[PDB]
XYZ file of C-alpha atoms in Angstrom:
357
model
C 0.000 0.000 0.000
C 0.895 3.699 0.070
C 0.653 6.308 2.803
C -1.282 9.563 2.832
C 1.717 11.734 1.933
C 3.064 9.288 -0.639
C -0.300 8.999 -2.395
C -0.579 12.766 -2.495
C 2.863 12.932 -4.185
C 1.743 10.332 -6.742
C -1.434 12.312 -7.371
C 0.595 15.462 -7.960
C 2.866 13.832 -10.546
C -0.097 12.387 -12.439
C -1.709 15.850 -12.220
C 1.284 17.591 -13.819
C 1.381 15.034 -16.618
C -2.391 15.410 -17.077
C -1.989 19.178 -17.460
C 0.662 18.555 -20.100
C -1.618 16.086 -21.931
C -4.848 18.121 -21.523
C -6.612 15.507 -19.360
C -9.380 17.153 -17.274
C -8.527 16.999 -13.587
C -8.740 19.085 -10.430
C -5.665 18.748 -8.221
C -6.624 20.981 -5.329
C -8.493 18.412 -3.186
C -5.273 16.492 -2.453
C -0.466 25.973 -15.171
C 1.865 23.488 -16.867
C 4.888 22.850 -14.677
C 8.275 24.304 -15.573
C 9.731 20.804 -16.151
C 7.043 20.083 -18.775
C 6.707 23.565 -20.311
C 9.038 22.682 -23.233
C 7.593 19.259 -24.193
C 5.168 18.392 -26.978
C 1.895 17.123 -25.422
C 0.947 14.389 -27.853
C 4.533 13.211 -28.532
C 5.007 12.768 -24.804
C 1.656 11.038 -24.237
C 2.221 8.483 -26.993
C 5.841 7.854 -25.982
C 4.927 7.432 -22.297
C 2.206 4.888 -22.929
C 4.458 2.987 -25.372
C 7.294 2.698 -22.834
C 4.736 1.258 -20.384
C 5.155 -2.482 -20.995
C 5.172 -4.934 -18.075
C 5.078 -2.577 -15.101
C 1.980 -0.703 -14.031
C 1.757 3.045 -14.608
C 1.861 3.761 -10.854
C 5.019 1.655 -10.440
C 6.615 3.422 -13.428
C 6.048 6.852 -11.889
C 7.048 5.715 -8.398
C 10.510 4.810 -9.715
C 11.111 8.522 -10.458
C 9.468 9.589 -7.199
C 11.690 7.405 -5.019
C 14.714 8.340 -7.140
C 14.041 11.983 -6.141
C 13.337 11.266 -2.455
C 9.584 11.962 -2.763
C 10.062 15.633 -3.831
C 7.352 16.450 -6.368
C 9.227 19.234 -8.154
C 12.451 17.203 -8.291
C 10.460 14.180 -9.511
C 8.699 16.053 -12.303
C 11.970 17.643 -13.350
C 13.593 14.209 -13.713
C 10.537 12.804 -15.487
C 10.356 15.675 -17.973
C 14.084 15.304 -18.641
C 13.603 11.589 -19.370
C 10.567 12.252 -21.574
C 12.667 14.772 -23.533
C 15.654 12.468 -24.037
C 13.885 9.090 -24.548
C 11.010 10.025 -26.943
C 11.337 7.162 -29.637
C 14.935 5.894 -29.768
C 14.941 3.168 -27.130
C 11.622 1.702 -28.208
C 12.935 1.338 -31.748
C 16.116 -0.301 -30.458
C 14.347 -2.934 -28.369
C 11.645 -3.629 -30.958
C 14.183 -4.038 -33.762
C 16.190 -6.443 -31.636
C 19.426 -8.082 -32.736
C 17.768 -8.770 -36.075
C 17.583 -5.078 -36.964
C 21.247 -4.580 -35.945
C 22.358 -7.414 -38.225
C 20.155 -6.316 -41.115
C 21.522 -2.760 -40.905
C 25.112 -4.050 -40.519
C 25.902 -2.031 -37.376
C 29.422 -3.479 -37.184
C 30.335 -2.345 -33.676
C 27.028 -3.364 -32.136
C 27.303 -6.737 -33.907
C 30.805 -7.196 -32.501
C 29.540 -6.497 -28.991
C 26.672 -8.991 -29.382
C 28.952 -11.703 -30.789
C 31.544 -11.313 -28.022
C 28.722 -11.733 -25.499
C 30.417 -8.875 -23.643
C 27.186 -8.364 -21.657
C 24.500 -11.069 -21.528
C 21.401 -11.759 -19.452
C 22.262 -15.037 -17.721
C 19.362 -15.765 -15.376
C 17.890 -14.353 -12.170
C 19.314 -13.386 -8.798
C 18.030 -14.634 -5.409
C 15.300 -11.944 -5.388
C 14.173 -12.833 -8.944
C 15.993 -9.934 -10.586
C 17.497 -10.540 -14.036
C 21.282 -10.805 -13.916
C 23.393 -9.193 -16.641
C 26.826 -10.851 -16.756
C 29.508 -8.348 -17.936
C 33.007 -9.542 -18.956
C 35.289 -6.505 -19.396
C 38.300 -8.599 -20.400
C 36.672 -8.809 -23.800
C 36.398 -5.040 -24.143
C 38.512 -2.984 -26.522
C 37.762 0.614 -27.389
C 38.951 -0.472 -30.898
C 35.842 -2.632 -31.454
C 33.102 -0.037 -31.789
C 32.193 3.655 -31.813
C 31.187 5.115 -28.462
C 27.709 5.578 -29.969
C 27.755 1.874 -30.863
C 28.751 0.847 -27.340
C 25.975 3.031 -25.981
C 23.327 1.611 -28.334
C 24.473 -1.890 -27.347
C 24.210 -0.857 -23.674
C 20.708 0.464 -24.143
C 19.641 -2.704 -25.929
C 20.917 -5.013 -23.188
C 19.323 -2.872 -20.445
C 15.926 -2.888 -22.200
C 16.214 -6.622 -22.790
C 16.720 -7.009 -19.006
C 13.564 -5.019 -18.429
C 11.588 -7.645 -20.353
C 12.632 -10.243 -17.678
C 11.032 -8.321 -14.748
C 8.662 -10.629 -12.841
C 5.308 -9.603 -11.403
C 5.417 -9.277 -7.613
C 9.241 -9.015 -7.688
C 11.700 -6.109 -7.931
C 11.616 -4.279 -11.235
C 15.403 -3.961 -11.244
C 18.501 -5.606 -12.730
C 21.465 -7.122 -10.938
C 24.839 -6.650 -12.669
C 27.756 -9.076 -12.352
C 31.067 -7.526 -13.472
C 33.489 -10.441 -13.768
C 36.919 -8.738 -13.823
C 38.846 -12.011 -14.189
C 41.639 -11.335 -16.620
C 40.679 -7.650 -16.869
C 43.666 -5.454 -17.817
C 44.183 -1.781 -18.677
C 44.087 -2.754 -22.390
C 40.399 -3.317 -21.631
C 39.802 -0.046 -19.740
C 37.715 2.797 -21.182
C 36.725 5.691 -18.924
C 34.364 7.344 -21.434
C 31.714 4.570 -21.556
C 32.091 4.184 -17.771
C 30.959 7.737 -17.208
C 28.318 7.507 -19.956
C 26.694 4.468 -18.388
C 26.770 6.147 -14.989
C 25.107 9.401 -15.944
C 22.612 7.892 -18.441
C 21.552 5.129 -16.016
C 21.188 7.665 -13.193
C 19.051 10.043 -15.237
C 17.012 7.584 -17.291
C 16.665 4.265 -15.392
C 15.785 5.413 -11.859
C 15.486 2.696 -9.210
C 16.381 0.036 -11.801
C 19.677 -1.182 -10.293
C 19.499 -4.122 -7.934
C 22.904 -5.426 -6.882
C 26.180 -4.458 -8.448
C 28.671 -7.270 -7.985
C 32.345 -6.622 -8.769
C 33.942 -10.075 -8.901
C 37.668 -10.943 -8.670
C 38.843 -7.372 -9.179
C 42.596 -7.401 -9.918
C 45.037 -5.027 -8.239
C 45.171 -2.734 -11.265
C 41.497 -2.041 -10.517
C 42.059 -0.204 -7.222
C 42.972 3.150 -8.867
C 40.146 2.736 -11.425
C 37.780 2.220 -8.488
C 39.043 5.375 -6.794
C 37.808 7.314 -9.820
C 34.554 5.465 -10.357
C 33.404 5.705 -6.732
C 33.617 9.501 -6.956
C 31.335 9.524 -10.003
C 28.794 7.240 -8.357
C 25.819 8.429 -6.408
C 25.821 7.021 -2.852
C 22.655 4.971 -3.677
C 24.539 2.976 -6.245
C 27.818 3.048 -4.285
C 26.384 0.786 -1.862
C 24.453 -1.317 -4.153
C 28.144 -2.416 -4.722
C 29.774 -5.527 -3.250
C 33.161 -7.024 -4.098
C 33.052 -10.809 -4.407
C 36.056 -13.162 -4.449
C 34.759 -16.719 -4.863
C 31.728 -18.887 -5.604
C 30.627 -18.844 -1.971
C 30.251 -15.059 -2.005
C 28.312 -15.245 -5.295
C 25.998 -17.807 -3.676
C 24.781 -15.104 -1.283
C 23.368 -13.267 -4.342
C 22.585 -15.828 -7.105
C 21.660 -19.497 -7.132
C 24.131 -21.917 -8.736
C 21.749 -22.792 -11.599
C 22.201 -19.234 -12.992
C 25.908 -18.710 -12.184
C 28.132 -19.545 -15.189
C 29.965 -22.867 -14.884
C 33.356 -21.209 -15.398
C 32.664 -19.118 -12.269
C 31.890 -22.205 -10.178
C 28.145 -22.244 -11.014
C 25.969 -24.684 -12.932
C 24.822 -22.608 -15.951
C 26.394 -24.221 -19.033
C 25.313 -21.542 -21.489
C 27.936 -21.193 -24.202
C 29.680 -17.920 -23.499
C 32.391 -18.295 -26.146
C 30.104 -18.759 -29.200
C 27.065 -16.587 -29.960
C 23.854 -17.767 -31.633
C 22.026 -14.736 -33.082
C 18.237 -14.792 -33.544
C 17.381 -16.619 -36.767
C 14.033 -14.847 -37.060
C 12.072 -18.156 -36.882
C 9.806 -16.780 -34.155
C 8.911 -13.434 -35.771
C 5.864 -14.515 -37.785
C 3.466 -12.175 -35.995
C 5.478 -9.128 -37.032
C 3.612 -8.865 -40.347
C 0.103 -9.484 -39.221
C -0.474 -5.835 -38.971
C -4.268 -6.217 -38.833
C -4.231 -8.088 -35.526
C -1.578 -5.708 -34.229
C -3.830 -2.738 -35.028
C -6.700 -4.382 -33.179
C -4.465 -4.949 -30.121
C -3.328 -1.311 -30.260
C -6.957 -0.174 -30.433
C -7.586 -2.251 -27.307
C -4.621 -0.554 -25.610
C -5.805 2.956 -26.561
C -9.230 2.208 -25.079
C -7.679 0.931 -21.821
C -5.393 3.972 -21.763
C -8.287 6.426 -22.056
C -10.210 4.588 -19.337
C -7.157 4.614 -17.067
C -6.790 8.380 -17.533
C -10.458 9.048 -16.779
C -10.512 6.874 -13.662
C -7.155 8.300 -12.546
C -8.424 11.882 -12.712
C -11.540 10.779 -10.809
C -9.363 9.249 -8.085
C -7.230 12.331 -7.846
C -10.268 14.555 -7.197
C -12.168 12.160 -4.931
C -12.705 12.964 -1.241
C -12.324 11.312 1.251
C -9.847 8.388 1.343
C -12.558 6.495 3.427
C -15.188 6.645 0.835
C -16.649 3.452 -0.662
C -16.323 5.351 -3.922
C -12.617 5.570 -3.059
C -12.485 1.767 -2.607
C -14.054 1.345 -6.011
C -11.811 3.926 -7.742
C -8.614 2.371 -6.376
C -9.763 -1.114 -7.358
C -10.565 0.111 -10.868
C -7.127 1.666 -11.250
C -5.577 -1.645 -10.216
C -7.787 -3.557 -12.686
C -6.999 -1.265 -15.607
C -3.289 -1.400 -14.653
C -3.371 -5.187 -14.835
C -5.287 -5.057 -18.125
C -2.677 -2.713 -19.607
C 0.153 -5.056 -18.704
C -1.782 -8.005 -20.186
C -2.422 -5.949 -23.297
C 1.295 -5.280 -23.602
C 1.851 -9.041 -23.168
C -0.499 -9.597 -26.077
C 1.088 -6.806 -28.170
C 4.718 -7.920 -27.728
C 4.768 -10.705 -30.386
C 3.349 -8.160 -32.884
C 5.920 -5.331 -32.515
C 9.149 -6.835 -31.020
C 11.615 -8.984 -33.007
C 12.473 -12.017 -30.792
C 15.813 -11.832 -28.916
C 18.202 -14.708 -28.264
C 16.455 -15.111 -24.886
C 13.085 -15.715 -26.582
C 14.689 -18.597 -28.522
C 16.694 -20.201 -25.701
C 13.579 -20.425 -23.532
C 14.766 -17.989 -20.821
C 12.471 -14.994 -21.582
C 8.644 -15.199 -21.375
C 6.676 -11.951 -21.862
């Protein structure tokens, strides 16, 4: 549940967005904000409801709220900044999948995929997806910085598709520094990933495991820890052996070469063959599913405005309004479930049985 104060914060954020989108609502019983004064209303509305996939709208907005310590103005500033930067890039990346990268011959992205530099390798003890990162296979020589960033964005969005209902909507990251050397070091993408993840994936980091760091890493760490927010800086734990990793991940997901039981082939990549993408061209069904979504979206807005004006928090009408918001939230996530085969090219995880949307 949520408290009085917290709910009022949530109501305020939805109110600001409603003012941007021209949704009737009265926010006094709980004009366009500075943070949203320079955004296009319908661009932002369509992009926001697209990026809503397997989390409920309330959970999506609460990530920003908690990221800004429950300060409404801070929260709406961060959310407007994200809406400005995101608009349609990421959605195109994740929906195109590896297939689009191959078809467009994006050499550096392809190289990163084929090295399996960063792969989703299972779930942690709290049911978060685990991205395994192996920096000993990194060379700044292998890709543009834009390429490395697009690759980063694709793996992070892939991870989001693994989020499980009733479990943290966040990703654990295992940096295996075995055999890492300064040949592999690249400060630019370090700092990119830090600031972009901080500004655009709030509350999306679960555990950050730095495993078998060599001595040459101590000075690197002295730099990176001063770029890190304190939130992330103690999401961070240094692990030395399989017994430490067991505190965070079960052996069935830990790669065999680390002492675990996961025998996934990390030295040879199998790219999506496209076998599972047959729904991508039945555009008629897809349009019907998107019409369903748009109807649910309008209903959710209407009910949400109702709930923001309703008094008191006692009311049986309040009971009903809350329950309706929950029901429409669930229906939106099921609708995304149904939409996914019609807009998203299958990833390697859809083929190897590990991802179910």
